[PDB]
Design a protein around this ligand. Structure first.
Ligand SMILES: OC[C@H]1O[C@H](O)[C@H](O)[C@@H](O)[C@@H]1O
Ligand SMILES: [Ca+2]
Length: 555
């Protein structure tokens, strides 16, 4: 049979922005725990939570200062234990985020490492002499400036691919590997069902740290995935940790060329179980990560087809249209204008829930939440944007205005505005002042309004989750794009054990038709959105309303 995770629907919870229960304006574990019935009723099998560890929060949990303690803002270890127990009560599973490319610079390992060149923890991190009067080499940081920071305590520089307060951990050091493996066991021994490995493809660094070529410089995120020992380390982690448990692992394979993805997820390789890739969600992002490039449905569907191709007989993909690092799904891939938001959000739900792979729904997407109307500099506050200011505005490459107009569309804060529970003060997320403002559209878009409405985005998601669960081909079926070149109507089949389903989604705000492949006809209509009526049994074609979606069994 297929592992539970291949037929699961996951929901991602960004705990900081999901539900606050003590009026400090930051979401927490008690808030999440209080909302499990809501997630269970939606039909969710397992939740992935963003990092929940002790953290100075320079990067909202991705800078961890103690891997064996809970972040103070979310609660205590007891609250974490209660979350797990309450999930388990409901037959639901927890996946946690694992951030072991780097720690906080406040982690005690780093506090020791920096003390001297002979410190026992010195090689828990990468320390190098400057060269030619400046940095060890020309590596840039994702979060601005050089990836090398001089520490005058020793006069050497340490490596940080991300923030200056996120020094990279040195996987070449076996005692470091052993500490990380022991840390992973600490959490898995508590009963955690899954682990998502953040930036998993950057763990291996190239011996000697030679300069990037100017080609590599223009795509340094890819260069940082090419360390010669990467798969050696992932295999060791599996041997020493995951072989001993039954937790699912997922890698956030950021930066890596798609053709390398099989090395991470082929089950025979004993590395990771499934891939988060970024080819789709960044399919319209420029190399600088902040400009957008126009794309069409043909580019969208062709990327999916390529990502599907790298999950062979033995590999497996996740599928997602949003996460805490990206704009809102309906804003990004749909049409978020008041007249099309609901219709297009339903369309994208149909896509999400009928893809081959394990779908992850990001918190709020089931309501049709949208991008935020940024109005002030403060609205954009985020370490990555601070870095774009450093790299692009201080250097005179762009004005602040150019940067913010563009980051309005791409800002990670679009995804981090509080979840909109109801139409009370701050959409019911907090009784205090939320850490990020609530989107003003919460008067219209909120869970309490949608749950009771048969025609809401929520109810559609719920109904799609039910259909997928009921229908094996829709989870583990083969996938085939009916016409990769079509830029109007996305259509595809899922097949398993001699049953074939057809998914058809108009991405245009206009009527369009669709002719089924010769020899194929409609047998039954499982569900549709924005349709006035279902096709007649035997139909060789369909008339589509704007943004209409449907799933059909064919014959
Ligand atoms: O840790 C640095 C970054 O790593 C991953 O890309 C995370 O998904 C992102 O939120 C984080 O800032
Ligand atoms: Ca709180």
């Amino acid at each position: 049979g297929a592992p539970w995770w291949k037929s699961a629907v996951f929901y991602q919870v960004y705990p900081r922005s999901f539900k606050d229960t003590n009026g400090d304006g930051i979401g927490d574990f008690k808030g999440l725990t209080e909302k499990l019935d809501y997630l269970k009723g939606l039909g969710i099998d397992a939740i992935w939570i963003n990092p929940h560890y002790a953290s100075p929060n320079t990067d909202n949990g991705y800078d961890i200062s103690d891997y064996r303690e809970v972040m103070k803002e979310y609660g205590t270890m007891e609250d974490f234990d209660r979350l797990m127990a309450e999930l388990k009560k409901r037959g639901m599973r927890l996946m946690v985020d694992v951030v072991i490319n780097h720690s906080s610079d406040q982690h005690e390992w780093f506090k020791s490492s920096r003390a001297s060149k002979d410190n026992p923890y010195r090689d828990y991190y990468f320390w190098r002499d400057g060269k030619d009067g400046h940095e060890p080499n020309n590596y840039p940081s994702f979060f601005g400036g050089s990836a090398w920071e001089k520490d005058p305590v020793t006069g050497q520089y340490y490596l940080h691919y991300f923030g200056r307060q996120q020094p990279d951990l040195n996987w070449d050091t076996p005692k470091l590997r052993e500490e990380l493996y022991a840390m992973l066991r600490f959490w898995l021994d508590k009963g955690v069902s899954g682990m998502r490995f953040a930036t998993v493809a950057t763990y291996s660094k190239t011996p000697g740290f030679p300069d990037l070529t100017p080609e590599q410089m223009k795509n340094f995120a890819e260069a940082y995935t090419q360390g010669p020992n990467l798969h050696r380390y992932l295999q060791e982690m599996h041997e020493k940790v995951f072989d001993h448990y039954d937790a699912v692992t997922a890698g956030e394979i950021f930066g890596a060329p798609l053709n390398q993805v099989p090395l991470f997820i082929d089950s025979r390789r004993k590395e990771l179980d499934m891939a988060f890739t970024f080819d789709l969600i960044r399919y319209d992002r420029a190399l600088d990560r902040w400009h957008t490039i126009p794309r069409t449905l043909a580019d969208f569907r062709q990327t999916i087809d390529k990502v599907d191709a790298i999950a062979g007989e033995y590999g497996w993909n996740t599928f997602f249209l949003g996460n805490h690092d990206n704009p809102r799904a309906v804003s990004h891939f749909g049409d978020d204008r008041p007249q099309w938001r609901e219709a297009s959000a339903k369309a994208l739900a149909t896509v999400t829930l009928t893809q081959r792979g394990t779908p992850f729904i990001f918190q709020g997407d089931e309501l049709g939440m949208t991008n935020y109307p940024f109005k002030t500099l403060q609205d954009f506050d985020d370490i990555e944007v601070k870095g774009f200011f450093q790299d692009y505005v201080e250097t005179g490459k762009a004005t602040a205005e150019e940067l913010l107009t563009n980051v309005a569309l791409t800002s990670r804060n679009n995804a981090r505005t509080p979840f909109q529970w109801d139409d009370s003060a701050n959409a019911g997320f907090t009784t205090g002042k939320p850490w990020l403002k609530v989107n003003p559209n919460y008067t219209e878009i909120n869970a309490a309004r949608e749950i009771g409405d048969p025609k809401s985005v929520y109810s559609f998601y719920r109904n799609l989750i039910s259909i997928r669960h009921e229908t094996p081909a829709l989870s583990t079926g083969s996938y085939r794009d009916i016409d990769p070149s079509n830029a109007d109507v996305y259509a595809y089949t899922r097949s398993q054990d001699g049953e074939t389903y057809l998914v058809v989604v108009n991405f245009k705000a206009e009527p369009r038709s669709f002719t089924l492949p010769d020899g194929m006809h409609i047998a039954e209509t499982l569900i549709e959105s924005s349709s006035p009526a279902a096709p007649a049994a035997g139909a060789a074609s369909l008339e589509l309303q704007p943004w209409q979606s449907g799933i059909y069994k064919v014959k």
